[PDB]
A = this chain, B = another copy of it.
């Protein structure tokens, strides 16, 4: 494929979707990463790369230029889920997109549950807005989609890419008691989520498998995330 510049940020789960995808494609060393400081965004980023002023975004093709001077001739692409499909298209040997039309629809249906159920319910519960039961119920929705063994549709796919960054960050939030509930409640919910026993036994197994995946670990700066999450809570 043509050259890829990825504009990303270690803190951002949506960006990590694209980093995971590239890693599963064993292409993470082919691409040029540029880290965006979301508290001090470069003045060229929005007008030249992504008018929404968010990561992730990719510049595709065009001439070799420094990443802080992106070329007008490169194709600019945004939105994490699209970028993950684009990577799976560009690198078919990644096997991120299943061949079977049915399994693709199922993988994407799982992504829709991640978008419309898991992420909103995690946001609402981690921010003190909703109940623990509301979060567990949304997880149970994903659990009910899981097959007896393996990942969201058996073989690892884009469905697992879409979810893992948010699961990895939830774990930090919960493990570290940063969820706005008294000391120890976060960790108890983390156990429900990932123990592999109880109402969420099967999801727990799946979650263990997602967090163990090499592409997740390789694109996740746990020390950095933990530090930033503690500091934010402290405010």
Contacts and interface: CB of A to CB of B under 8 A. Distances in A.
Contacts of A101: 1, 86, 89-90
Given A60-B102, A75-B102, A102-B75, A109 B89 contact: no
Interface in A101-117: 101-102, 104-106, 108-109, 112
A160 B112 CA distance: 20
Oligomeric state, in copies: 2
Nearest to A99: B89
Interface residues of A, number: 20
A22 interface: no
Interface in A67-93: 75, 77-79, 82-83, 85-86, 89-90
Nearest to A116: B79
A85 B78 CA distance: 20
A104 B85 contact: yes
A109 B75 contact: no
Contact of A83 (B77, B78, B105): B105
A145 to B, nearest CB: 11
Nearest to A141: B51
Interface in A147-183: none
B105 A77 contact: yes
A82 B86 CA distance: 16
Contact of A112 (B79, B104, B105): B79
Nearest to A61: B102
B112 A86 contact: no
27 contacts: A1-B101, A60-B102, A75-B102, A77-B102, A77-B105, A77-B106, A77-B109, A78-B109, A79-B108, A79-B109, A79-B112, A82-B105, A82-B108, A82-B109, A82-B112, A83-B105, A85-B104, A85-B105, A85-B108, A86-B101, A86-B102, A86-B104, A86-B105, A89-B101, A89-B104, A89-B105, A90-B101
Closest 8 CB pairs of A and B: A89-B101, A86-B105, A82-B108, A82-B105, A77-B105, A79-B112, A90-B101, A75-B102
